Design a protein around this nucleic acid. Structure first.
Lengths: 114, 59, 148, 52
RNA sequence: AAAUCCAGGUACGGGUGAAGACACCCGUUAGGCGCAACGGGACGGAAAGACCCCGUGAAGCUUUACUGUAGCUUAAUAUUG
RNA sequence: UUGUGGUAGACGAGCGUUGUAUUGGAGUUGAAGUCAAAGCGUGAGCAUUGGUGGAUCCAAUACAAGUGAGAAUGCCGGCA
RNA sequence: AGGGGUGAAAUUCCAAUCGAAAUCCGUGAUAGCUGGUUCUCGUCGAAAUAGCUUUAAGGCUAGCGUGAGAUCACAAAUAAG
RNA sequence: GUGUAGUGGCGAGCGAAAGCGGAACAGGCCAAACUUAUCAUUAGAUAGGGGUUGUAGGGCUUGCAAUGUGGACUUGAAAACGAUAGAAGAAGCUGUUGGAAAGCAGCGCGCAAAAGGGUGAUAGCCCCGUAUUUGAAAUUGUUUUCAUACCUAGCGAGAUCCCUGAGUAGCUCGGAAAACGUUAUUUUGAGUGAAUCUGCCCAGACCAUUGGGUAAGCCUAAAUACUAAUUAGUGACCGAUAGCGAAACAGUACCGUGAGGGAAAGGUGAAAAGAACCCAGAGAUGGGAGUGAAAUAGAUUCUGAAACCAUAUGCCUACAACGUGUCAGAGCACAUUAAUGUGUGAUGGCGUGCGUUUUGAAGUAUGAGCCGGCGAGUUAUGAUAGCAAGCGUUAGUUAACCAGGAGAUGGGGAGCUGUAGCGAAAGCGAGUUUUAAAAGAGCGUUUGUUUGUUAUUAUAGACCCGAAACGGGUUGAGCUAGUC
RNA sequence: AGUUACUAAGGGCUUAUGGUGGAUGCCUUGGCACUAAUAGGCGAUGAAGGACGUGUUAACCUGCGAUAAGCUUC
């Protein structure tokens, strides 16, 4: 018996087309170009799911160091004071949120100087 | 499928799976060899495992 | 059972379909590699064809046949080992056509053979015997008649 | 399951698809378990004993 | 109306790298979109290449290359003393 | 506890398509298809609803395959 | 009228193509060489070495994977002397 | 039997004859001694009878025993079976939905027919028809029965008197079927050339012996291969890029002078009720109206997906160096397969396509315009190995074929595997071969079989697509060249 | 310098609509393969295959054949 592949091809092609939306030119009409765009976007997102956390960590370091320089103490000295003695388990991101609430990070500053 | 007669003539089977053969240089022009070679090549012989696999599917 | 749940005891193997799967399942052209005669159509070189060197069957001498046009004047052998375990006595052709041991539409010569002491008295009728078989059958007071 | 194939069963029971008649030497395992309900005449019950 | 056409919104210098980059890295410069000319490039378009080399490939031709054979020639034999 | 980069390959485990044999079920109170939708999936896939359709399909088990399309300087039909 | 014709003879023509026409069949001609070979998740995971070969893009055996089985400290690696 | 005996650059590859099991199963007729007539019986020719063969027979001369039996066989009649038109052939209402009931629910009925088809949606009882019973003027086919035919008949006694197939077989040189690539066997192009059955040859050279059938003349149904066609049916075959090339007004249009090649193109609706009529425009046409359950049912006529072309809701862009996205991220618009919502994305972080073949590819390597459809690892037979089952400790097991729903299954042990091997073989045997030597060494020291599936593979085009060519048959001198 | 009303000649994204194009799905007046039988040739009394012609019904197809979409017998 001759067997056709009608529904399965259409359903898979429509699903793959639906998987991407918001492309430029004829990158959302053809199945082939849509698959290419999905592959590239997925690989880029795979690398991003690590590069974003790297960049966010760098940004947190930058924004902590900004206030640290404003107070007059270098970032390395502050981390040494946190590590060498006065043991504290404080994420480098949490300290940033303490800067948006005044008198908290200032309290940490007045504490670490002991 | 058709067992080659050229292979059926020079290979006789043996129980448990094996073949027997006569060595070369035995019954031909070889006066330039020692008597040790002559009486060593007289005895029957067998093939290697690789050649056994090669011949087994052909027979 | 009924014809809605019939399933055997886990006997359904897997096949190698070489037409689907670019990187999934099996290879795109499995058992063939790439850039080769074994991969091209009408390949599968001859089993005895090693290609370059002289074939093994041509490098060795041949065993002749001292009986041109003959295999042997075949006669049926009768081992003393297995017959003892079989419940029979006074063995002739008609005895051996009973338990489907010899042909019932043709006749061939019979030769007794083997060496094993008997515990039940039996008498044999064959054309050829053996010395060890002779002493084995004489131990159990058996008899055999030389039949032409 | 009849042994003599009388005309009483041959003439009738040829209209209903669900049920039908068959001789002993013609039945099959697929046909046997396709029934889910069977009637057997006692006459064959000795013969089936002999042949297993 | 056409060949072609992986889609593209399609600058340059230096270096770089499958060894000569519209995209790579570093600098430079540049409103969006047409018009009419000009061929610098996009190793452009046009044909699985005819200054080759492998195919234990084809084709045609040649001679003291092999094996033949048409035809020519000689002998025995039959028609036929 | 060891682990879980990976072609060609080796092996294992599965989906889906058409039809067939029981087995039930759905169907002019609107099935197949189709589009859309801000679902379920470890995967092919599976769903729910809304517009178009006016006649057949779905489920649990095996069976048999012209069975699963991105290239083939491809083929057809249509359109830049 | 094609292992042919015609040729003031260039390999010129023989229905736009002629170093041998076109057409049908043998003929799914052969093709160590091109290109392509489509469902999906899991475990392991190599080579480009040797020998032989009218062999050099090829083909075999061995070395080098994988699956099943066996080897129980005599076995193979990791250390020191 | 068997992939056996063998055959072959002893390579590729080729491959029987026996026997057995089976399907069916009948053997007869001329010439040739003699004999009869007519040929001036010098006839040698035309006819007549007999004789049809080897457990040799026939012919010559005498004897009985019987009109036996068969046909493949001449013509009439009868019987039966049919075939080419046929006929008869049962059983339902009510209600709801719905345009339409035939569905769906309540109560029914027939059924040797609840095979099929059509009927305003999915009918055992609406219809045709289906089981069953049955029918033939004529043309015919088959078998059986009788008679008409044709031909057709068993056993002897004497006796070597005669006959039993001529350019005939072998022989020599060259050719062909036999598995053999030419050897017994058969055939023949050329030369050679006997026997009268007592003899001739056969048994893979050849003679002797042993046994067999009698060569040089003819015919013969039966099992067997096929299907254009008729009739019926069936199909785990196609359902309009498939399947015959042609679902149709296809071998058509067309291509080329010809031979030849060669397509594509089905669907309104329950029924045309196919749009009366009005309006706008010289007109097709469209909008209303009309029929219809429905004009996304309108003759471009089932559904109309994607590439493609425009339209509109909202958002965004005119200092912008970009494999066009990804992650955060402002405003705006809204509010949803009820979700820590979606769409738009001014900005920042990051940045080199997809298969291919390649040591190495974003490439200045190639392939792709896109979308849609079609479009490449099977089957037959045999082998080996794995997985699982039946079976059994003298096993397992069927092939063809007969029986039957173009069904398993029963009947079918023919044969095959293993049950003892060693050796080239004779031959021997738990031993065998080499052997002076049972030394030593090599091989044995019984330990299964048919299946279903999977993997590879042997022959068949054997994963898919792609040559320049070869040979065989055809058609071309109208173009051109030559000749008349 | 800059926030920033109005900007879109045009284009981009999502959504919805219309046309183009007939994929998909339904069935089909037909195709192929076989089973059971029959039958396995026609023909100089003119074949098969064709040309031509025959209409109230043009034209095509079909049937037919100076008796022309047919005639006679049973």
């Amino acid at each position: 018996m001759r067997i056709k592949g009608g529904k399965q091809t259409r359903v898979r092609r429509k699903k793959w087309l639906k998987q991407a939306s918001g492309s430029f030119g004829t990158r959302h009409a053809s199945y082939k170009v849509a698959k290419q765009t999905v592959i590239q976007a997925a690989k880029y997102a795979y690398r991003d799911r690590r590069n974003k956390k790297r960049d966010f960590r760098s940004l947190w370091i930058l924004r902590l160091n900004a206030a640290l320089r404003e107070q007059g103490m270098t970032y390395s000295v502050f981390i040494n004071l946190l590590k060498k003695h006065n043991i504290e388990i404080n994420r480098k991101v949490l300290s940033e949120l303490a800067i948006k609430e005044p008198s908290k990070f200032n309290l940490i500053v007045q504490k670490v100087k002991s | 499928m058709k067992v080659k007669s050229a292979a059926k003539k020079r290979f006789k089977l043996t129980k448990s799976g094996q073949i027997k053969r006569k060595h070369a240089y035995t019954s031909h022009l070889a006066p330039h060899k020692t008597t040790k070679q002559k009486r060593h090549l007289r005895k029957q012989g067998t093939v290697s495992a690789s050649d056994f696999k090669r011949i087994g599917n052909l027979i | 059972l009924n014809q809605l749940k019939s399933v055997p005891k886990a006997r359904n193997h897997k096949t190698k379909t070489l037409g689907r799967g670019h990187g999934s399942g099996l290879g795109k052209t499995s058992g063939r590699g790439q850039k080769g005669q074994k991969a091209r159509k009408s390949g599968l070189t001859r089993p005895g064809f090693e290609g370059g060197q002289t074939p093994l069957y041509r490098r060795l001498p041949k065993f002749g046949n001292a009986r041109k046009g003959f295999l042997k004047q075949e006669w049926v052998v009768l081992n003393l080992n297995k017959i003892a375990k079989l419940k029979l006595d006074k063995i002739n052709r008609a005895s051996l056509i009973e338990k489907q041991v010899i042909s019932a539409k043709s006749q061939l010569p019979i030769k007794l053979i083997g060496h094993t002491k008997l515990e039940k008295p039996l008498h044999f009728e064959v054309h050829k015997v053996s010395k060890q078989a002779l002493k084995a059958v004489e131990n159990a007071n058996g008899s055999v008649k030389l039949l032409e | 399951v009849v042994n003599t194939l009388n005309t009483n069963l041959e003439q009738s029971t040829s209209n209903i698809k669900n049920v039908q008649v068959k001789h002993l030497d013609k039945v099959s395992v697929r046909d046997l378990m396709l029934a889910n309900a069977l009637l057997v005449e006692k006459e064959v019950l000795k013969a089936l004993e002999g042949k297993f």
